[PDB]
Amino acid sequence: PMPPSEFLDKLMGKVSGYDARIRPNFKGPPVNVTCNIFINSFGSIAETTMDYRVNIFLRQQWNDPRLAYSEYPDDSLDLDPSMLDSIWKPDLFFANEKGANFHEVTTDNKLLRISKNGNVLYSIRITLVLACPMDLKNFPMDVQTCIMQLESFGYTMNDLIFEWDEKGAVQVADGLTLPQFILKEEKDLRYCTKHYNTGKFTCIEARFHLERQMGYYLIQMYIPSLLIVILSWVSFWINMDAAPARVGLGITTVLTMTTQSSGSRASLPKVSYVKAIDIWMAVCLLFVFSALLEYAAVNFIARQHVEEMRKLFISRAKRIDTVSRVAFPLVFLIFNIFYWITYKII
Amino acid sequence: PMPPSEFLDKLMGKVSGYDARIRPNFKGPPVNVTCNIFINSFGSIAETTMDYRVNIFLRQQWNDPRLAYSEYPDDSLDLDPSMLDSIWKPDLFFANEKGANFHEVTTDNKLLRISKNGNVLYSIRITLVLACPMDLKNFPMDVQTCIMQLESFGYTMNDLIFEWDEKGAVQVADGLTLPQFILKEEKDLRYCTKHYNTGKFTCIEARFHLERQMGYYLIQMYIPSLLIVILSWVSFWINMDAAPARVGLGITTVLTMTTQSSGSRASLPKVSYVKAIDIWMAVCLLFVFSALLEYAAVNFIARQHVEEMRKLFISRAKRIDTVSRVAFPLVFLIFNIFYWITYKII
Amino acid sequence: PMPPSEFLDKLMGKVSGYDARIRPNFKGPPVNVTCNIFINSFGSIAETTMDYRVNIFLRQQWNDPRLAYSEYPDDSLDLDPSMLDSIWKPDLFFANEKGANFHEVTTDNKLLRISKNGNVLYSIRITLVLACPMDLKNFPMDVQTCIMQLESFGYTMNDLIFEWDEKGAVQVADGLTLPQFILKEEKDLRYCTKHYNTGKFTCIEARFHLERQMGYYLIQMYIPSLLIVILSWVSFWINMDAAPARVGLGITTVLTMTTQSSGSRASLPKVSYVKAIDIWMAVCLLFVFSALLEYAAVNFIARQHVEEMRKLFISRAKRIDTVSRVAFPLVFLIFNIFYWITYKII
Amino acid sequence: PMPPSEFLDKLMGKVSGYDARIRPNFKGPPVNVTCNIFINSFGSIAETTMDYRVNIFLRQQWNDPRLAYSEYPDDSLDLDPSMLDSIWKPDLFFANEKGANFHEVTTDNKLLRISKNGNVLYSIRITLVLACPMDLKNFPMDVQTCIMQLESFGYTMNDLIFEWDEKGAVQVADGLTLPQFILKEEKDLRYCTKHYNTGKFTCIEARFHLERQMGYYLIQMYIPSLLIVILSWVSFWINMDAAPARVGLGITTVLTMTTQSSGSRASLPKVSYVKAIDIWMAVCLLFVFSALLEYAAVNFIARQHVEEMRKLFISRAKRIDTVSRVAFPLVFLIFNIFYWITYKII
Amino acid sequence: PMPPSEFLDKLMGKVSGYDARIRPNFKGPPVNVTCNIFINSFGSIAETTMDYRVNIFLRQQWNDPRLAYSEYPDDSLDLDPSMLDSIWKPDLFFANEKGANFHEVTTDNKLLRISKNGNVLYSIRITLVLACPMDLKNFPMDVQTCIMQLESFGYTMNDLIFEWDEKGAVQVADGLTLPQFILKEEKDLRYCTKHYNTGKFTCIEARFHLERQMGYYLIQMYIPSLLIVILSWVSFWINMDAAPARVGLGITTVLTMTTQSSGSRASLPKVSYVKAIDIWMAVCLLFVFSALLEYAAVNFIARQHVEEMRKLFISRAKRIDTVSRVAFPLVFLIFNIFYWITYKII
Ligand SMILES: *[C@@H]1O[C@H](CO)[C@@H](O[C@@H]2O[C@H](CO)[C@@H](O[C@@H]3O[C@H](CO)[C@@H](O)[C@H](O)[C@@H]3O)[C@H](O)[C@H]2NC(C)=O)[C@H](O)[C@H]1NC(C)=O
Ligand SMILES: *[C@@H]1O[C@H](CO)[C@@H](O[C@@H]2O[C@H](CO)[C@@H](O[C@@H]3O[C@H](CO)[C@@H](O)[C@H](O)[C@@H]3O)[C@H](O)[C@H]2NC(C)=O)[C@H](O)[C@H]1NC(C)=O
Ligand SMILES: *[C@@H]1O[C@H](CO)[C@@H](O[C@@H]2O[C@H](CO)[C@@H](O[C@@H]3O[C@H](CO)[C@@H](O)[C@H](O)[C@@H]3O)[C@H](O)[C@H]2NC(C)=O)[C@H](O)[C@H]1NC(C)=O
Ligand SMILES: *[C@@H]1O[C@H](CO)[C@@H](O[C@@H]2O[C@H](CO)[C@@H](O[C@@H]3O[C@H](CO)[C@@H](O)[C@H](O)[C@@H]3O)[C@H](O)[C@H]2NC(C)=O)[C@H](O)[C@H]1NC(C)=O
Ligand SMILES: *[C@@H]1O[C@H](CO)[C@@H](O[C@@H]2O[C@H](CO)[C@@H](O[C@@H]3O[C@H](CO)[C@@H](O)[C@H](O)[C@@H]3O)[C@H](O)[C@H]2NC(C)=O)[C@H](O)[C@H]1NC(C)=O
């Protein structure tokens, strides 16, 4: 019962002629590689960049007859990771990496165990910054689907095939929550077989269904956008005398409404389509621009009105200042219903 | 008495058949690894990212019978760190690293000494950026508990076990203070034994109880939020004549109160729950929005009031402008008591 | 039928005297290297820096007679990438890299296959941050032409020549869209043969015609710039009595128009020439500065006007306040036509 | 007279049995290592992070009898830096590195020369980002003392000792100035002998006395803070009639004074103690808050004043508006004297 | 006619005893190294950091008799760059690197050719971030002189000397323009021979004369600073009645003039000396502060004026409001002439 590495000497070195430069079952059927990932860290979901950082354990399993062994008694030899640069390993890469890296802290974070019948279990900790093109049409109420797809790079489909094992292909750490999102529990697992001018390459991808939390965007942008609408209404309970007051009120509540429009996109890409948060800030910018025009009508109607005529327009001009107090606060409401219900069924 | 490395030649090389690729006490009980950390640098506690950077010395101790020696006279051979790539070392990693690194400046910052009975003392300087999910419910008065946990990655529980030595498992440099926090002196030391679809892996974690200093947030956000509330009150000692003054006063003190609401979260994650600093900026935004409505009542009540009737509402409208001077400054106070006492016992 | 690497032993090692340090067809005609790129990731088109990040697959093809083989039966031996540090490879570099890198995640992302007649197919995943000097004359309506050029660095033109293969020299991933641009489908392919004091070096470049999307810049800068122009007009339907109102209106709508001028260049280089977005913000800053002067004329003309004289200037001063309501809203329009048509045919 | 490296062959290789893995004078007295640094680049003194970047040449000198030589005629053999991975070198590290690095541009920036009697001169270019906890009590007038300390990491005090040579232990490049500071010329040199649970380790540190330049902070924060105080005074030469003017004046000069308070700390850590720049912005925020209350008294006193009574308070209310014009401008001055003299002797 | 590397075998390996660890002409005169650089990328001229990034080709030439060859027929053997780790190479470094790096994309970007008489031509692509202390006295009209200097680090002056070849020591790529600067065509080439406590080291530096483009700073800071001065003048064509208007006008045009003062230094170091852009923003801040005081005089002079007396000061107070309309607009102009002419001859 010699030590395992010396047993591994019989397994790896020039004895038996193991070559790590040639895939298993060479010249025969392709190599069936079953995969699955464990997720430690999920988050930093960027939107200026439209990517996100994950921290996974990538488990790979394939059979290699050359790694058979019956001398040793037990069923598994979880070796040292230094034995990992000498056996064959599939050239798995992430088709949307945007930068990734291993982890070498106190050891290469690597695992490797071999079953008697040649089954290999290979597992390494990885940090990825995967690209997912965000779809920001209905932005605060959107549901993103950021993917990650595992391709081969040098082996064609007839010489290396990936799969997902049918027992929980994607696990997640227990207490894993996101600050801005929630990660839905059903995770898709479909095929993405690529085709180039070089050949066809195996591919498999996992679809994570993110979904934004409404709390933050409800506190910083919607409510402050809404109070500024109400102050635009207090220009109606003021007489048609305070020219500086109402105009000063409206202008101050139309420029601050312009700042928050731009402020609602500081942390966003410069996309060219209008998004759900945009029509809110637009329509809220339309009401406030109306009250500054409503007083524009009053101050002009009253100034234009012999003595039986001037009061004749005071009633009309003052009729407006009472219609305004109900028109705006209710027209805004019915709009406020068609908006949220539009994004409660979309 | 040959030189130690040549003595180490007898200890390491092909003589005696030392293999660094196989753990001590192989096929027997697992390897008991006692740990403890020394902390040089603690800080850069991020909250947008919810991590923090530490600079530790990681000390590991385990027994290895193969490293026994009785030839040399003294009790310890603190070797060169180049002898560190040839002996066995536990594959300790940090389960929430988020990026780490060694230090190679003028030497690998590594220590290694071996006692006669085989005890190994292994110590290396590390920089870590550990992830700790912040809980920002009561934000300026919160108490975070950021952890660090030491797991194995390739050895299962029956073949490698970590522990904390029971003599000061976590030391700290003497004059170590944080700018924003204070690091409490009692540090937890519990177990975090993991379970995967691969097996069970040893784990141990240290719980550091951070606690925010109230000084900064008391100077930039609470007091400026409070002066703006008081200026909202000076719209009461002004007659019910200065329409531009009081409305200009209230509007200017309701928008600047909106900026500071958003300004109170520039360096924060976009969490979806309301936090303690939020109800302050909200309630302070409610008082100021009230004074702008209080004058909305006065200017409307006085404008609506034969000659025995107009003065009848001047008293009512002026009754308000005196009730306001005591109502707001005292209602705000009683709120100001239920707030701080709520976060002095929570 | 020995294994291929051992077949490759006959192909690479000291047998047959293959030297990777000497180009093919040595002392004869130069080495004809046909190229083409596949683009996975395109974007992060910076403008403060005037660069952009691409993620390509660089395919290279050249003949090497030394790599001939007739022993093996089939037509191609797609080897392991470890066989890539032993064969000759052209020293292709990117003449405007500004930083690049390979991808080592789970494998060097490399491909290598050899045809029987010696044809080499070499393909590697690369991330580039290529420099392209932006031309921002007509900025929101511009069309950039960012290049990428493949030069030799050590081999002169008579010893190594690059080319583009005449079957789709530049492919693109199917669903590849940009957030801010659209990538036109015709891609140029011309020569860029360099000359130094060392000699002449082969060079080939690809010209990508980017083109900005107008949606974002139409929403954040043009419309907000335009509403502020209209509020500058509401200072005309107000009587020549509200000195605080109209002046407060104009000043508030002339400073906020100054902020947006500077705000229209936060994410731009500090170029010294005037650009298309600049004349908009300038002319819009000229109208608003006019209305604040138009009231400057009214308040001065009315204040200067025995009793038959004061009304004589009221008509003139009030004649202005009606000419203004049509002059500005129509002069702005005709300008608004010469502007967009100027950038619809330029 | 064979070539020196072949002479060095007799000096380094298996001939003579030189081992680089064992310190000089082994088993005897410790190794006396005299040090000194030359500073090329000093600066980037961060305060959000409380560190700073230096670029030094670290010179080390120790004796090694094994490196004796009398064959060669001259006194010094400045070798190639490749000979630096074969001789012993002290494991000097920087106890507050916070990240450092060598320089490999066109060569490892390393020097190495050996005197006949065994004296070694070892010198390498380094970039450091050293941590120094700032003390920001009297911030714009402060004097920081950022240190750098050279410790051993694996050798205890009885086996390796550092020192500073007594001929200019710290030189500086000639034209080395800082943008924000000035580096005082006397530099401290004391001992910092550490103690751990492992043993006692040699340590030496250099104390650089930085001192801020007052020019910048005098131009951006003090003067603008002071003009805004004066405009708060121009609310006194205005009659007690312009309710919108004085209140608009005071409010506009009390909120802009709040912005600059927060603006005076954008580039600062979130420390919890009040600092010298804070009491300035506070007291300046107290004067401006007073003038807005001073008019609060006037408009209330005049509004409260049969016909012999109303003028009786006009004199009192107008008595205030003249006392204000001298009270504030002189009370501010005497404060302005106790402030600067307080930070001219502290 | 064996292959060149095998010819190079006779040139490099143990045959002939070539040692790369010993400089040419050893024990004799020093090694004369002629240099010159080609500049691809110039720019990213930082000012917060006072550095800049360049992308050069560094060509070095020296003679090495050991590399003589007469066997081969032609005049030059441009080898593979792998032959670059075996020949001697001067240890050139950049005395103000602040971080640099090679380029390894698809090959080490290296060139190496050897003439028959031993002349070596060595050329490598480099990216540098060189430090140049900016002199910002007359900031928008300044002319910086950022240097780059090539020193030895281990060889003293009597054993290695650098030079510039007298045929175009510094070339530049053809279409190389900067966004903010223009690179003057005459480039200095002088000596910078260093002296340390170790010895004297060869040094040579190149002086690039940068010069700012005035376009950007003329558009964002001077003109907006100037319009705000003119609006400060429109407080003069308004009667001495509009207390809220003129004071509101002046205050709004004195605070926005304070923001732009600070805004004129966001991207600048915190230098302690006053700079040319500072006196502009200061003097422009002095005019606007004057108009707010000019009305302070009017409203006080008119309010202080039996019936023959009140009109007596109306003329004096109104005499001011006409002197102002010519005093300020012309005093500002004459200042505006002494300013630009002062920076047209400095
Ligand atoms: C990797 O897995 C794939 C599919 O999971 C295997 O492909 C299939 O392999 C079988 C060999 O057992 C091939 O033989 C076929 O058998 C069926 C009866 O089961 C017979 O009716 C067919 O005529 C054929 O002979 C089968 O063609 C093949 N199918 C495909 C789509 O590839 C593959 O063999 C596995 N390879 C390894 C190395 O494990
Ligand atoms: C590492 O440490 C663990 C615990 O600190 C050791 O586990 C224990 O090891 C003993 C061997 O001395 C095992 O024997 C047990 O002894 C008790 C009497 O002390 C006896 O009553 C039991 O029936 C049993 O024979 C013990 O089972 C084991 N317990 C556990 C929970 O593991 C371990 O031996 C140490 N290994 C090394 C290599 O130091
Ligand atoms: C690489 O490709 C270039 C061009 O694609 C080849 O250049 C040409 O190579 C031919 C050899 O077949 C040279 O011979 C010429 O042939 C024509 C008839 O086709 C004859 O009229 C000429 O007098 C001459 O003999 C030709 O000069 C040469 N032209 C150029 C511009 O280089 C090159 O041979 C290819 N090299 C390899 C290694 O594939
Ligand atoms: C490194 O430097 C230290 C101090 O600079 C040296 O320590 C001293 O070394 C001397 C050996 O010459 C030791 O001997 C002492 O000599 C005095 C007379 O000078 C005698 O009165 C004492 O009784 C003792 O014998 C001395 O104890 C020792 N002192 C200390 C504090 O270490 C050291 O020898 C130097 N080592 C090397 C390798 O250069
Ligand atoms: C590297 O270049 C330097 C200068 O470019 C050379 O320095 C000079 O080298 C000459 C050898 O030819 C030395 O000899 C001198 O010759 C003059 C006549 O030309 C004679 O009048 C002097 O008395 C002396 O013998 C000369 O001293 C020396 N000068 C200096 C300042 O170094 C150097 O030789 C070159 N080295 C190599 C290896 O190319």
Cβ contacts of D86 within 8 Å, gap of 6 or more = D12, D18, D20
Tally of CA atoms within 13 A in the half-sphere of A41 that contains its CB: 25
Q: D321 in helix, strand or coil?
A: helix
Q: Could you give the 3-state DSSP secondary structure of residue B203?
A: strand
**Residue D71: burial class (beta carbons within 10 Å; 0-12, 13-18, 19+):** exposed
Tell me the HSE value of B326 on the side-chain side, using a 13 A CA sphere. Answer: 4
Q: Find the farthest-apart pair of alpha carbons in chain D and give their distance in angstroms, rounded.
A: 122
Dist. CA E171–CA B334, nearest whole Å: 76
CB atoms closer than 10 angstroms to residue B129: 18
- 3-state class (DSSP) for residue A244: helix
Taking the C-alpha atoms of residue D205 and residue D337, their distance in angstroms, rounded to an integer, is 39
Check if A61 has its Cβ closer than 6 Å to any atom of ligand 1.
no
Nearest Cα of chain A lies from the Cα of B109 at a distance, in angstroms, of 12
Please calculate the CA angle E64-E69-E70 and round it to the nearest 5 degrees: 145
Mark yes or no for CB contact D21/B41 under 8 Å: no
E205 and E163 Cβ atoms separated by less than 8 Å: no
The answer to whether E177 touches C131, Cβ cutoff 8 Å, is no
Annotated binding site of C for glycine: 59, 123, 198
Q: Is B230 helix (H, G, I), strand (E, B) or coil?
A: helix
What is the pairing mode between strands A200-201 and A194-195?
A: antiparallel
Tokens of B323: 């009730």
Give dist(CA A2, CA D15) in Å, integer: 37
Q: Which of A280, A218, A226, A340 is nearest to B270 (CA)?
A: A218
Q: Give me the phi and psi of C180, to 5 degrees please.
A: -105, -20
Q: Whose CA is nearest to atom 33 of ligand 3?
A: C29
Breaks in chain B (C to N over 2.5 Å), named by the residue before each, are: 305
Residue with structure tokens 């430690």?
A: A40
CA separation, residue B187 to residues B130, B146, B181 (Å): 17, 11, 15
Q: Can you tell me the distance from the alpha carbon of E332 to that of A121, in angstroms, rounded to the nearest whole number?
A: 81
Q: Which residues of C touch A252 (CB under 8 A)?
A: 252
Phi, psi of D135 (to 5 degrees): -115, 105
| DSSP symbols for C166-228 | SS-SEEE-TT---SSEEE-S--EEEE--EE-SS-EE-EEEEEEEEEE-SHHHIIIIIHHHHHH
B-chain residues within 8 Å CB-CB of D196?
A: 38, 57, 171
What are the angstrom distances between the C-alpha of A89 and each of A120, A124, A262, C82, C123? Answer: 10, 12, 51, 12, 19
Residue C93: Cβ within 10 Å count: 22
As a whole number of Å, the CA-based R_g of chain A is: 33
* Cα(C101)–Cα(C103) distance, integer angstroms: 7
Measured distance between the N- and C-terminal CA atoms of chain C, rounded to whole angstroms: 67
- Give the phi and the psi of residue A134 in degrees, each rounded to 5: -65, 145
Kindly state the tokens that stand for D158: 């009885």
- Residues B229 and D125: their CA atoms lie apart, in Å, by 57
Question: Is the C-beta atom of A138 inside 6 A of ligand 1?
Answer: no
- The SS3 assignment for C326 reads helix
Paired tokens of D298: 């006037």
Helix H or strand E encompassing E161:
strand E160-164
SS3 A275: coil
Neighbours of E341 (CB within 10 A): 10
Q: Which helix (H) or strand (E) holds C276?
A: helix C276-304
CA dist E158 and E59 (Å) reads 22
Could you report how far apart the first and last alpha carbons of chain E are, in Å? Answer: 67
The kind and range of the H/E element at A19 are: none
Query: Was A328 annotated as part of a binding site?
Result: no
Q: Give the Cα separation of E139 and E122 in Å (integer).
A: 40
Distance from residue E187's CA to the centre of ligand 2 (Å)? 78
- Chains with 3+ CB–CB pairs under 8 A to A are B, C
Q: For tokens 């205050």, what's the residue?
A: E251
A123 appears as a binding residue in the annotation: yes
Helices D276-304 and D307-342 cross at an angle (nearest 10°) of 170
C65 burial type by CB count under 10 A (0-12 exposed, 13-18 middle, 19+ buried):
exposed
Residue A130's nearest CA partner among A143, A149, A103 is A149
Beta bridge partners of A324: none
Number of separate helices (H) and strands (E) present in chain E: 6, 15
For residue A93, give the nearest of C80, C109, C224 by CB distance.
C109
The closest CB to that of D248, out of B82, B231, B248, belongs to B248
First-to-last alpha carbon distance for chain A, in angstroms, is 67
Q: Is E25 in the pocket of ligand 5 (CB under 6 A)?
A: yes
Reading the block at residue B224, the tokens are 């400026």
Q: How far is CA D133 from CA B49, D55, D130, D271, E79, in A?
A: 23, 20, 10, 11, 53
Q: Put residue D322 in one of left, alpha, beta given phi > 0 → left and psi -120 to 50 → alpha.
A: alpha
Angle of helix B276-304 versus helix B307-342 axis, rounded to 10: 170
- Resolution for this PDB entry, in angstroms: 2.9
The alpha carbon torsion through D282, D284, D290, D291 (nearest 10 deg) reads: -150
Strand positions, DSSP E, E187-324: 188-191, 194-195, 200-201, 203-212
Residue B142 to residue A157: CA distance in whole angstroms: 55
CA angle A58, B101, A104 (to 5 degrees): 35
Q: Which atom of ligand 5 is nearest to the CA of E161?
A: 1
Tokens standing for residue A151: 């391709």
Instruction: Please check if A16 is assigned to a binding site.
Output: no
To the nearest whole angstrom, how far is the Cα of B248 from the nearest Cα of chain D?
Answer: 7
The pair of three-digit structure tokens given for residue B64, joined into one six-digit string = 């290895």
Token pair for B248: 């200009």
Q: Which of A27, A31, A32 to mutate to test the pocket of ligand 1 (most atoms within 8 A of CB)?
A: A32
CA distance B42 to B49: 16
Q: How far is CA C192 from CA C59, C200, C328, in A?
A: 19, 11, 53
How many CA atoms are closer than 13 Å to the CA of C188, on its beta-carbon side? 14
Measure Cα distances from A211 to A43, A146, A180 in Å.
12, 11, 8
Count of C-beta atoms within a 10 Å radius of residue B81: 18
The angle at the Cα of E310, spanning E309 to E314, to the nearest 5 degrees, equals 115
Q: How far is CA D311 from CA A73, A98, B259, D240, D315, in A?
A: 113, 79, 43, 14, 6
Contact E94, E153 (CB under 8 A): no
The two three-digit tokens of residue D247, written as one number: 């209140």
Confirm or reject: Cβ of D32 under 6 Å from ligand 4.
Answer: yes
Compute how many other C-beta atoms are within 10 angstroms of the C-beta atom of residue C116: 16
Residues contacting D75, CB < 8 A, separation 6+: D115, D116
Ligand nearest to the CA of A30: 1
Size of chain D, expressed as the number of residues it contains: 346
CB of B25 shorter than 6 A to ligand 2: yes
Quote the minimal CA–CA distance from D220 to chain E in Å. Answer: 6
How is residue D84 annotated by DSSP?
Answer: G
Gyration radius from chain C CA atoms: 33
Tell me if E196 sits within 8 A of D38, measured CB to CB. Answer: yes
**C249·A251 Cβ contact <8 A:** yes
Spatial separation of the C-alpha atoms in residues D52 and D45, rounded to whole Å: 4
Whether D170 and D37 have beta carbons less than 8 Å apart is answered as yes
CB contact at 8 A, D260 and D224: yes
Chain-centroid distance, C-alpha D86: 38
Q: Which residues of chain B are within 8 Å of residue D155 when distances are taken between CB atoms?
A: 78
* CB neighbour burial string for E217-231, b if at least 16 within 10 angstroms, e if fewer: bebbbbebbebbbbb
Structure tokens at C329: 């809203």
List phi, psi (to 5°) of B51.
Answer: -145, -170
Q: Is E212 within 8 Å of E142 (Cβ atoms)?
A: yes
CB contact under 8 A, E6 and C21: no
> Annotated binding residue at A209?
yes
Spatial distance between the Cα atoms of B147 and B130, rounded to a whole number of angstroms = 8
Is the distance from the beta carbon of residue E32 to the nearest atom of ligand 5 less than 6 Å? yes
**What gap in Å lies between CA D190 and CA D172, rounded to an integer?**
19
Residue located nearest, by CA, to atom 9 of ligand 5: E29
Atom number, ligand 1, closest to the C-alpha of residue A24? 38
- Ordered DSSP codes for B53-107: EEEEEEEEEEE-GGG---SSSSSEEE--GGGGSSS-----EETT-SSEE---SSS
Task: Give backbone dihedrals phi and psi of D94, rounded to 5 degrees, phi first.
Answer: -105, 115
How many residues are there in chain E?
Answer: 346
Q: CA nearest A136 in C: which residue?
A: C179
Question: What is the spatial distance between Cα C166 and Cα C204, in angstroms, rounded to a whole number?
Answer: 13
Which one of B94, B102, B254 has the shortest CB-CB distance to A231?
Answer: B254
- Atom 9 of ligand 2, nearest CA residue: B29
Count of residues for chain C? 346
| Three state DSSP letters for chain E | CCCHHHHHHHHHCCHHHCCCCCCCCCCCCCEEEEEEEEEEEEECCCCCCCEEEEEEEEEEEEECHHHCCCCCCCCEEECCHHHHCCCCCCCCEECCCCCEECCCCCCCCEEEEEECCCEEEEEEEEEEEEECCCCCCCCCCCCCEEEEEEECCCCCCCCEEEEECCCCCEEECCCCCCCCEEECCCCEEEECCEECCCCEECEEEEEEEEEECCHHHHHHHHHHHHHHHHHHHCCCCCCCCCHHHHHHHHHHHHHHHHHHHHHCCCCCCCCCCCCHHHHHHHHHHHHHHHHHHHHHHHHHHHHHCCHHHHHHHHHHHHHHHHHHHHHHHHHHHHHHHHHHHHCCCC
Cα D253 to ligand 5 centroid, rounded to whole Å: 75
Q: Return d(Cα E164, Cα E180) in angstroms, integer.
A: 29
- Which of C326, C311, C318, C327 minimizes the C-alpha distance to C297? C318
Burial of B254 (0-12, 13-18, 19+ CB in 10 A): buried
Q: What technique solved it?
A: cryo-EM
Q: Which two tokens stand for residue E137?
A: 């006295």
Which sequence spans correspond to the domains of chain A? 1-213, 214-346
A59 is in an annotated binding site: yes
Residue A89's contacts (CB-CB under 8 Å, 6 or more residues apart) are A60, A122, C106, C107
Distance, in Å, from the CA atom of D238 to the CA atom of D224, rounded to the nearest integer, reads 23
